[PDB]
Amino acid sequence: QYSPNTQQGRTSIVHLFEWRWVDIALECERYLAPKGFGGVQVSPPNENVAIYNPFRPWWERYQPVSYKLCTRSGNEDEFRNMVTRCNNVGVRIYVDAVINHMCGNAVSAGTSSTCGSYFNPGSRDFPAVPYSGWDFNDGKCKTGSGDIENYNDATQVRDCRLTGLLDLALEKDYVRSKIAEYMNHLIDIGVAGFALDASKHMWPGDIKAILDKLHNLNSNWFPAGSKPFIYQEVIDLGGEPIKSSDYFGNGRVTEFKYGAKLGTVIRKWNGEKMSYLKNWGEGWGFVPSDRALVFVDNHDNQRGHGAGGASILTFWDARLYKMAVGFMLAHPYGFTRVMSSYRWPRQFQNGNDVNDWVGPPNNNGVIKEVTINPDTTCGNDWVCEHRWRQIRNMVIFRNVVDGQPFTNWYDNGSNQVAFGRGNRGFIVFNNDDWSFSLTLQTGLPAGTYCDVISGDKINGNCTGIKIYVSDDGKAHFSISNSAEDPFIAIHAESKL
Numbered sequence: 001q002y003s004p005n006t007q008q009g010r011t012s013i014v015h016l017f018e019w020r021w022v023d024i025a026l027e028c029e030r031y032l033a034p035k036g037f038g039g040v041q042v043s044p045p046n047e048n049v050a051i052y053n054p055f056r057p058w059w060e061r062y063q064p065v066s067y068k069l070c071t072r073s074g075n076e077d078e079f080r081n082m083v084t085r086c087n088n089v090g091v092r093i094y095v096d097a098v099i100n101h102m103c104g105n106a107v108s109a110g111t112s113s114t115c116g117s118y119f120n121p122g123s124r125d126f127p128a129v130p131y132s133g134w135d136f137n138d139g140k141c142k143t144g145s146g147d148i149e150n151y152n153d154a155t156q157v158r159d160c161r162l163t164g165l166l167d168l169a170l171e172k173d174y175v176r177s178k179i180a181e182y183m184n185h186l187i188d189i190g191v192a193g194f195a196l197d198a199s200k201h202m203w204p205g206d207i208k209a210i211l212d213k214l215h216n217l218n219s220n221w222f223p224a225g226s227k228p229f230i231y232q233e234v235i236d237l238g239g240e241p242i243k244s245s246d247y248f249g250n251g252r253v254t255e256f257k258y259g260a261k262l263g264t265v266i267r268k269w270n271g272e273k274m275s276y277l278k279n280w281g282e283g284w285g286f287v288p289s290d291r292a293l294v295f296v297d298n299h300d301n302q303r304g305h306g307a308g309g310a311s312i313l314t315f316w317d318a319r320l321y322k323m324a325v326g327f328m329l330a331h332p333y334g335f336t337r338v339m340s341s342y343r344w345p346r347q348f349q350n351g352n353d354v355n356d357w358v359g360p361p362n363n364n365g366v367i368k369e370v371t372i373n374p375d376t377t378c379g380n381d382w383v384c385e386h387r388w389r390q391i392r393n394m395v396i397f398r399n400v401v402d403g404q405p406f407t408n409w410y411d412n413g414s415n416q417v418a419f420g421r422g423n424r425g426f427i428v429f430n431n432d433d434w435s436f437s438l439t440l441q442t443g444l445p446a447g448t449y450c451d452v453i454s455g456d457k458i459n460g461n462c463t464g465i466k467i468y469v470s471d472d473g474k475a476h477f478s479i480s481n482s483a484e485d486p487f488i489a490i491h492a493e494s495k496l
């Protein structure tokens with residue numbers, strides 16, 4: 001459960017938030033495969049409630065109606081097509097599995113679903129699964145409202161409804177088997193793993209029971225005995241009775257403290273500085289690296305909908321965001337996931353964005369296709385951060401330095417730091433309000449290297465900054481606090 005099952009050489013997965021299946025299949029072939037991306041995290045592929053008020057928000061996909069592969073992203077045929085094509089090119093598919101609950105208990109009964117499936121939240125009836133009143137733990141929850149009211153009570157956090165979402169009785173073998181049937185269907189199709197949504201709201205033992213019913217990966221693409229990659233979404237920022245370490249026996253866990261602390265450091269909040277990142281990782285109280293799933297921002301907290309708060313960096317803070325993602329992709333801690341979003345009309349009323357529910361670019365509810373501009377950027381409101389040179393090149397940087405130790409660390413006691421990865425890579429950062437000009441030890445072999453942040457290595461030449469490393473591995477770095485990208489990265493494969 002702990003290995004991503006990516007092709008040797010690929011070290012990151014990208015979350016193509018709300019992308020259609022056909023667009024992902026194309027992206028796998030035309031860009032993800034050639035640029036060295038290990039895999040893609042897709043949005044929930046199972047039927048969800050169609051919410052028209054507000055108009056088709058992104059969170060409607062976290063309110064299941066059934067397990068049919070029928071969503072705004074496409075149907076089962078298109079989904080299968082995408083997994084085959086992506087797998088055939090070495091790019092794995094990870095599914096966002098919403099198995100802790102069904103839709104909101106207050107949702108209207110009828111056929112307002114993405115596949116026309118009938119459902120009645122009031123009577124706990126979901127015939128398309130099928131599920132009934134006996135499959136929910138309305139009788140198990142002990143709160144007066146039936147919802148979770150106190151996170152200091154680990155019991156209600158797991159047995160009560162998260163903001164009204166009908167809670168499934170995961171202790172029942174019937175329910176465990178219905179969820180496993182859904183996941184095994186996806187595994188046999190070709191998926192390599194799953195992101196377990198709201199894992200904090202499920203008992204570690206109930207999850208284990210379910211994972212015990214799952215098949216090994218499809219032997220047509222994976223070696224015999226391959227187990228699905230599992231990363232549990234547990235928001236543990238400390239202070240609660242529930243700990244993310246309680247889920248270690250099931251697989252990896254999302255480390256939400258990672259993006260939160262990186263944000264406050266890069267933003268220089270509370271007097272924090274980049275020089276403190278010297279012992280970044282377990283030294284900061286994070287979970288063990290071999291159990292961590294890290295990211296800068298996620299679909300939730302990028303719109304103030306998740307843990308992290310106001311410190312979280314997103315594409316909106318382009319300059320600082322590129323620097324944070326760059327540090328993450330260069331540092332050895334955990335397995336990295338890159339975010340890929342879409343633009344929405346942010347509208348801060350009282351320090352709050354009242355348009356944080358807005359769903360993906362669409363035409364009367366129909367998701368817009370991802371169009372590629374001549375410069376490789378995306379159109380139709382898709383941000384495509386994974387296509388930004390600075391990020392795309394750092395993804396490759398991680399692949400090239402995979403396995404190399406953390407060394408040659410340098411810092412000015414402020415916000416000017418640098419470090420290398422064995423003898424395969426070196427990165428320098430300038431987050432101070434002044435210029436950086438100094439000769440540093442890179443531990444790299446002598447030669448001329450192309451800076452992969454400002455440019456690219458094309459045709460035996462660099463399109464951006466060039467760095468000259470001497471015989472003793474020393475090289476001079478000059479970064480003005482006025483540079484578009486205040487950091488420089490060079491590696492073995494960017495050498496001339």
Ligand SMILES: *[C@@H]1O[C@H](CO)[C@@H](O)[C@H](O)[C@H]1NC(C)=O
Binds near residue numbers: 459460461
């Ligand atoms: C580097 O580019 C210049 C032209 O811009 C040329 O002198 C040289 O041949 C190029 N080297 C290669 C290998 O193309």
Ligand SMILES: [Ca+2]
Binds near residue numbers: 100158167202
């Ligand atoms: Ca629960």
